[PDB]
Amino acid sequence: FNTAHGGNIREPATVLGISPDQLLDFSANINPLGMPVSVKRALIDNLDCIERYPDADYFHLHQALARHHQVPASWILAGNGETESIFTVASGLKPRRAMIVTPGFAEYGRALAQSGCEIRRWSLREADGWQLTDAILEALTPDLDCLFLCTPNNPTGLLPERPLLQAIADRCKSLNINLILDEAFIDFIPHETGFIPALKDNPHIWVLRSLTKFYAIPGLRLGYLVNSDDAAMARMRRQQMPWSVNALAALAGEVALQDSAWQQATWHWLREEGARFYQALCQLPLLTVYPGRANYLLLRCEREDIDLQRRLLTQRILIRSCANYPGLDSRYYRVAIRSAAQNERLLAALRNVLTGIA
Amino acid sequence: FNTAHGGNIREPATVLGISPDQLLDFSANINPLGMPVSVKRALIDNLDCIERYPDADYFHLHQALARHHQVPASWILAGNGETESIFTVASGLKPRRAMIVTPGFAEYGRALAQSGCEIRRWSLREADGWQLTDAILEALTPDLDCLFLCTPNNPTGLLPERPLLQAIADRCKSLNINLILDEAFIDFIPHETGFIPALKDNPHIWVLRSLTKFYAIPGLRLGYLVNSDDAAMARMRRQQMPWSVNALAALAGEVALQDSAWQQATWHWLREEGARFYQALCQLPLLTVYPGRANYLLLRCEREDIDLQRRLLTQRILIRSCANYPGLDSRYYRVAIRSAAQNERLLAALRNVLTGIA
């Protein structure tokens, strides 16, 4: 099969002729700790709120997000998943010319194509280990309207250094280029604040955030966009679709942000099991594992003519094939980092495929 | 205040300086019976499904909708509320020239404007009691790409006769005009099948449906579009935003359609309390009440210089002001039809404002 996004367990299970609950999914990167306790309680206790429309202005949710980031509520716009925020920014900025970095999340290109923009692709290089380098600076030109970066990048998991991002931000300010930073996974990286704390003096920077992966609520759909340009955000708001965020997602979001132990618990797990996982994967023969900073890792299979996703699916483990990402080929795959036990089943499966081969 | 849509209880309460739970809302038209029992159970029992992304293809939901209408599943596309279905059809059909009927739901014009279409408005007339007449047929011309009708119309509640809709449908087929029928409230009208049963031989007809009002789940956000043109629907699907429908909405939708007593219970209430409500409203002096067919009624206040919404809000009852609808003015308002008790509070409030006045 050829799926545009991971997490397609129903489709994968159908390919094998079995029930989705029989697959162990490593193709979507959801926090393994599961749904925050308080969130589950809040949903059960306030389920009747679905009998009314959500607040079209999402006052409570926006206030919660603003309190969390200590920024004016006017700088924030919640969306039906960060995927909606990507389409919102693309349609609201309507760039004539925009640059994206490949490989990267497919939706940037989809949103830009539909908005009628001329798309330029800045290609990351295998020889550079897929890292974003300062070579992109010379590629930025006055005629560019937007530049979209993913920090960290999906699927490589690599995080551009702060100095390089500042240099890019500064050149964009100077060349009148809007800089959109997709921080969907920034919460997972222990010491990483992102750019929200620097928007006050940078109205040309837009930050995309998601709550689905970090708080394990991808099924609720919730993300948001943050920007300090009063006029531009007003435009995003008046052009938006009404009631995009469902009432339970708004509730879960507000509650999730109250859990003051969640961030630490997640970072500890990533620091312990996540590092142990990277290590074990690197020990496997015929496999290159890139140093991802969040809860997923890009793998490059060195074994010739072998479909790792097909072989692991036979063992009822679903992984992401990155062959469809521009710039990557059939040797590349991506796996989530999950609980130790689940990670152990993935490793044992990879070993059967890669161990004892000349 | 000037709200684009009703149901704005948080905004209304803020205007008065009180909590939203202190207002009785007649400005949104949600089934008063509340959430179907089975739906509530299903949500509570399957709450953990939000830990995974929804099925991007919504296999189970689409199969349920197809079984319900006895049509191929390929003819259906679920959306994040019928509002999303309106934007989907507008963006997917990208009409160069389109006609809408005013007054009508505001989102048609919003979706068309953003899609860059030349909008023509067919004006309903106060002298006709706001009924759609065959005069529109001569207004249809070959250069039209789309014609959007609301059946029944919002806010008038009037349902164009089947013969007129067939005549419009036939002329559209002949002039190569796509006909989009918004059946959001068709479920409330006792003997009304809508056009889904006639799409097989009419690929130029698109039907919009909503589950939020009839099953009282506006907070979950769920609607869908139905059309029999294989190629056109394929286009709507490949151009769509991924995971638009949240997992709980998909679950509620499937379950709600299983309640075989819901339709009857709702029609009975509308036949009893709804008729008694129309009658009581007509007895009030200085007030014209249009004969709405679903769960809402358009009111025209005959009392000079009186803001009925402002006066009722002082009594903690929120109603819809239709002054913002093109074609209507400050004399027009809309109220939901709710439970007998709630309807009794609205009537007593209207009486204090309209009774005993020369």
UniProtKB/Swiss-Prot annotation, chains A, B:
Known role: Decarboxylates L-threonine-O-3-phosphate to yield (R)-1-amino-2-propanol O-2-phosphate, the precursor for the linkage between the nucleotide loop and the corrin ring in cobalamin.
Family classification: Belongs to the class-II pyridoxal-phosphate-dependent aminotransferase family.
Gene3D superfamilies documented for this protein: Aspartate Aminotransferase, domain 1 (3.90.1150.10), Type I PLP-dependent aspartate aminotransferase-like (Major domain) (3.40.640.10)
Source lineage: Bacteria, Pseudomonadati, Pseudomonadota, Gammaproteobacteria, Enterobacterales
EC top class named in words: lyase
InterPro entries assigned to the protein according to its UniProt record, in alphabetical order: Aminotransferase_I/II_large, CobD, NHTrfase_class1_PyrdxlP-BS, PyrdxlP-dep_Trfase, PyrdxlP-dep_Trfase_major, PyrdxlP-dep_Trfase_small
Name the UniProt record assigns to this protein: Threonine-phosphate decarboxylase
Named cofactor requirement(s): pyridoxal 5'-phosphate
One GO-annotated biological process of the protein: cobalamin biosynthetic process
Coiled-coil parts of chain: none
Subunit structure and binding partners: Homodimer.
GO molecular function: identical protein binding; protein homodimerization activity; pyridoxal phosphate binding; threonine-phosphate decarboxylase activity
EC number: 4.1.1.81
Binding site for O-phospho-L-threonine: H5, G6, N29, N154, R320, R334
Superkingdom per UniProt: Bacteria
